[PDB]
Symmetry: D3
Subunit: 246 residues, 6 copies
Amino acid sequence: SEIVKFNPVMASGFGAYIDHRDFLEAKTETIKNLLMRQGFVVVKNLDIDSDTFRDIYSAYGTIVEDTLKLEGEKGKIVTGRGQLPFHADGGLLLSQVDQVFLYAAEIKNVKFRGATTVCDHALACQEMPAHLLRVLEEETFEVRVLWFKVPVFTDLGWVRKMLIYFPFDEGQPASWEPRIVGFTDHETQAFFQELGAFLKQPRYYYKHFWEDGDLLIMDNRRVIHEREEFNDDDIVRRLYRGQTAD
Amino acid sequence: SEIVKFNPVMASGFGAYIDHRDFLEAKTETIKNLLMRQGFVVVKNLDIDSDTFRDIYSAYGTIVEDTLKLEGEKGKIVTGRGQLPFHADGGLLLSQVDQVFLYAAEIKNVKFRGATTVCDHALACQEMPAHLLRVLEEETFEVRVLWFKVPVFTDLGWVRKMLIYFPFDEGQPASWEPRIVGFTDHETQAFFQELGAFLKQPRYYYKHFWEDGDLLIMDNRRVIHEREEFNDDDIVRRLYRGQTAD
Amino acid sequence: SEIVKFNPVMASGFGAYIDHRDFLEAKTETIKNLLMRQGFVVVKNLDIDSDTFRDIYSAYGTIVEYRDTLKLEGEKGKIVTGRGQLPFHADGGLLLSQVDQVFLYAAEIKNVKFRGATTVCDHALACQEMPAHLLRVLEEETFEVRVLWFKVPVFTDLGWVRKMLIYFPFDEGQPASWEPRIVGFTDHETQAFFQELGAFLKQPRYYYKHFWEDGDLLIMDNRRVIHEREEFNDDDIVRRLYRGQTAD
Amino acid sequence: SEIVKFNPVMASGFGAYIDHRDFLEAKTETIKNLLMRQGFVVVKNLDIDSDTFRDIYSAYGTIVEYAGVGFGYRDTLKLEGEKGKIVTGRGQLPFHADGGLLLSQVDQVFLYAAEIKNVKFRGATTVCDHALACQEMPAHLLRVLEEETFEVRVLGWFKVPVFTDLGWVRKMLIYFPFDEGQPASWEPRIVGFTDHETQAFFQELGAFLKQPRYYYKHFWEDGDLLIMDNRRVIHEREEFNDDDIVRRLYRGQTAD
Amino acid sequence: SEIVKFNPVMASGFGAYIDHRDFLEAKTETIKNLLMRQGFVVVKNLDIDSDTFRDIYSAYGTIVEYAGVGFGYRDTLKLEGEKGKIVTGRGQLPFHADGGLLLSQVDQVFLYAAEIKNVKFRGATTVCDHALACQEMPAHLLRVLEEETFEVRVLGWFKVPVFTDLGWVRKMLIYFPFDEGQPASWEPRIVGFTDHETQAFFQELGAFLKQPRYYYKHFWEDGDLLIMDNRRVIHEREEFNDDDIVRRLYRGQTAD
Amino acid sequence: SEIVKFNPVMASGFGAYIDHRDFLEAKTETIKNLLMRQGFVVVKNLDIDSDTFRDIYSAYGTIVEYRDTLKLEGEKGKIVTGRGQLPFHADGGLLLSQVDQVFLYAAEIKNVKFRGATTVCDHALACQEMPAHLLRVLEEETFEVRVLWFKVPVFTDLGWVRKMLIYFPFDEGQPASWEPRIVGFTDHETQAFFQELGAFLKQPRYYYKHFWEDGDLLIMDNRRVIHEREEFNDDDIVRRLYRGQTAD
Ligand SMILES: CC(=O)N1CCC[C@H]1C(=O)O
Ligand SMILES: CC(=O)N1CCC[C@H]1C(=O)O
Ligand SMILES: CC(=O)N1CCC[C@H]1C(=O)O
Ligand SMILES: CC(=O)N1CCC[C@H]1C(=O)O
Ligand SMILES: O=C(O)CCC(=O)C(=O)O
Ligand SMILES: O=C(O)CCC(=O)C(=O)O
Ligand SMILES: O=C(O)CCC(=O)C(=O)O
Ligand SMILES: O=C(O)CCC(=O)C(=O)O
Ligand SMILES: O=C(O)CCC(=O)C(=O)O
Ligand SMILES: O=C(O)CCC(=O)C(=O)O
Ligand SMILES: [Fe+3]
Ligand SMILES: [Fe+3]
Ligand SMILES: [Fe+3]
Ligand SMILES: [Fe+3]
Ligand SMILES: [Fe+3]
Ligand SMILES: [Fe+3]
């Protein structure tokens, strides 16, 4: 049972900053293990190509289809230039995703836009006002792709894996749209605005501003994530994405 | 994915008090799941016999040998009347134990002795002074039965499962004896006294005083536990113990 | 002196969730005592009519009238009994009537899941922790109210608590039953004070939102907390509450 | 409602240090009210005599006489460290609240320092925030306090109700065992607990109650006034068994 | 070493409220020392004139003159809400620290209230505990402050070093953008950041810095004295654009 | 003005773990600055001799002498250079010598894993949070020391910190190099004050224990922290430290 050296990202002890030499010396299982309790791994100054990226992520499990190039294409949604709001990977196409990997191939002209952000949902659900948690636990959430049930919590024991799909902000091209059964439009919009503000408080929320060579690894059962908008044509933001499951 | 109603035991949110009707209505997997994150389940006023006890615990996995009667026998250690200090189940006989169940068959003349106590090791290891954690992570711990290595941490991802065997207090009949390699007798005694006091602080530590019909369930990977002495001949303290693993 | 079993509502330990059987088996004095230090009591799954509701509340003291039980049913073209917001207040400072305990029971709730909340604020904890420039206004300045001008004292030292009597301004678009002013403050200043104080008191440490379901009973100790009703201006909503008020 | 200026004594916001001039200008009702939520009031540099002390304390309610009936004469108890005594003696008075129930209840306790010499780290009067302590204690300690019968005898056994629910607080009455070597006027027991259990309970509870979050130690100086709301706190006197110590306090008690 | 009595302003223990008599009896060095760790000193009910104000502040170091050189005459700046001006005007002064570097550095800033009328909730001078805020902020905000080049122009671009490490504190110099509608004497930019990014950064940082844990608002009354250790805090003036408001402060600056 | 990368040692954010390469690449002024607000710096995995150690420390100011580098090697029948406890203190108040920075380097450590620690106390945080009856003695009472009687002031207001000079009593059985007393206090009272204050300062919030390994460098800002050496009275122990002291 090996140990990797790390520093916490959040003040709560969640998250893991890992030095690139330490990351590469470490076995796949050590990082895979650490991700379950830390939710996310941040590695800076890693110099790899797309093939080496594939070799790193494919050791963590079976690949969920292989590498998605998120390069900010004008006219697209997921591989486009706008917001991708709070979600977990996999549950809209109904494939299990355990680990999500994001590598920065090229970042130019962007310093305070285009963040990938990460939320500690288990701590947030534990600390949130009773009225927010009640809706999440007892109500039926449905999603349509731009109507089917997406279960909010799936009890894996060690965590209640969260699957949720937030509404896109006004003015951002929407890839999905949520609804809550028995809730009106006014109510669902209010709920998400309020839950969203709770989840974005700095105790649970990490914003990653990308740089060349960054690697962001997320345990898809332990956190939910978001992309912030980067709708300025001068921005080059090319990320590579890999996805594994067991 | 079902939900059981519960209240936290500790101020930190750890532990689960579950009402006996709620416990019995709940599926085995719901309780098994909750134990992974809550460490322990406390149920009061349950009226079962030893056969029903067996039927409840055996649904959680394969039985580790079947039911041990801990009835306070004068002349014995584990089934005796004195202290059993901080330990996890299974690692001295080298059998995997995932869940430990304790049911109070009969408690008479005891109100502030004979506690089974439970420690939140993952929170404690996270918050403990660096000098205590360093010994636990880097040094070799050995145990002899009254010399072999017992690994302190076994990384399961969701938790670092702890296996440790504290020294018995002076005057208590010892079933095991620990040692730390490269540490003298003075050092090892000092280490355990200091770590023991850290672990027994109320943020991480729950003491259960037994009553007829209590059921204590422990996830053996998430917590370590102890029995406090009950060396008064007037005390009747009969517990039934079951152990499961997957 | 007996004990009811309860769970706290707030992370601070304020509030009391009480099981319906535990509530009904408890003596009146036991709940009435609990309310002084816990502020509010939430009971779910009760199935009582208006007479039984009256029997429960009237045992806590002398009935304060408006005419005992007020039916808040969301009647259109009305205020208190209307469909809009009732901003932060304590009961009984507009009429000169002492109100110690306020009782709210849900007789019928339909088509509403995230609107029409009755909310509750732990004002003693909030006043103890608020920035000094907000507290200073509350403690030393004169607050007046017009019923839609008279002095309403913010604090009344009862010892165990400084009872709060305050009447917040209604949001724009919500029909006002009252209107506050602070003497020596301009209209800009009063609006800014209340907006900032409102946001402070709405922080989750001090603030509980109760979304109503059939059979819920909310009891508030009126000296210990202040409260608010959020708007429910959708015509599909049925929200019928029974209201009782007591004092000694 | 009138307001007095004060600073909190505890980090939790409990307690009230009040400047002497602010205390003297204050109405009796202002301090009496504050005491309910702050538990205790500490005033330094008050130069009063026993008559003036009496006029200050007697305004707060009916005088509870110290203890074939009473006529209002036994008002001010002089705790002057008299050898051969307990309450007015020189040893420890462990955790308790004053008075009893019904007519012998005490709401406010007043302690003024007439003369203190040769003592800098013994003889403290200490004060415990019991309501916050009971809210935060491990449940195994709280359960004993809430569900068991505590009995006391004078140095035959009588029940002392731990909690009396006044609503605003659960008024506490408890009598901790005197430490070994200290002369005892009382002895506690818990029904159904053995001597070992009771000794262990009180030791652990004591340690919990003495944590700085809930506990204030008052080291006496001439002119100090310590007022306690007896329903809100419990208190203790630490030992002063050194013959060179002069420690004379005046004690006053009131109730409504 | 001499000690002054004070109460903390913030819940974190930062800030110092000092009674006027205690301040007046205090040696200059006692307050100057306290200011380094408490950031700011608040004194109420001081009835002094501008000459006496000058004698108080000039004892703390060398007078920094307000701003073809200086001869010690431009000492006390009268901020009297003069229309058509910015610093001595009636609008917002957003987050900044006084002075600059080297010879134009300021260690202590003094603000005394000569006359305040018709204002109860506008025109505050506000104060931010930047060292605690920088220690607790999300790392994405701290990284910008630590690694990017901040430039400012007067209303051509010049670099303002965010942190100057004095050891005991990282002395902060920053100039936040004036809010829309408020007359600006300065404009910031961040090198390599766009206008959108810079606007978004300052908005988020501003909100973080204005949280009550780090932020104190001072609403002025006649006789108030606000002293700031300029290396330890940053400050702001909120707008007072109402013609009925009289708000006249005297400003003094010193350095070692 | 440059930046060294560091991690805090304490949960409060006090202390600085600095990687050996980062330490050696940093300017002296950068570490010296960091020490004022962080109290202490811990560097592991250095491999330097005594001359290099001297070069590193002497750049921080004027060398304070005892004779520059003190070899603390555990010589028997000695005190400071001995094998026993050195209780809580700051350097340089027994001789009248200003000491700003103290440097400790591990040249050789054998057979010791849980003894002989150099411990460090965050006294400014501790004094800000201590019970008022402990602080009162420290602030208003006269403390005297006998070197094995003269006044040593507890606090010296430097502005940024109140520098602490205090000399705790040695535990029974440990050879005393000094002896404290408080004027106006009896022997019972002084012993009780220190035992209770010692336990307060040893709480994990304020207290770090450094167990020594070959190549460790511990630097302390002597105005900002106080320190202690715990006993190492086992004859099998090799514990050889180099010690440097600077001031301005
Ligand atoms: C890969 C993945 O699972 N994605 C892409 C973004 C949203 C989410 C989805 O299911 O659409
Ligand atoms: C069942 C079990 O695993 N036990 C019994 C007590 C100690 C531990 C052991 O391995 O000895
Ligand atoms: C005044 C009072 O009630 N006293 C005196 C000391 C303890 C307590 C008692 O013995 O009852
Ligand atoms: C005194 C001082 O340095 N001032 C005046 C206002 C802002 C700042 C400046 O403009 O530099
Ligand atoms: O581009 C990003 O920052 C994240 C995209 C993402 O979340 C996804 O592809 O699932
Ligand atoms: O008897 C008890 O309280 C616990 C015994 C125990 O821990 C065991 O048998 O493993
Ligand atoms: O929520 C409600 O409708 C009750 C609000 C209220 O305060 C009242 O009617 O006086
Ligand atoms: O002497 C004291 O310190 C207080 C004595 C006391 O508590 C009492 O008489 O009840
Ligand atoms: O007028 C104020 O409130 C302070 C003005 C100020 O900060 C300045 O002149 O630097
Ligand atoms: O830990 C050590 O040996 C150094 C202790 C010390 O303070 C000294 O030698 O002055
Ligand atoms: Fe995604
Ligand atoms: Fe066991
Ligand atoms: Fe109301
Ligand atoms: Fe007493
Ligand atoms: Fe300024
Ligand atoms: Fe030393």
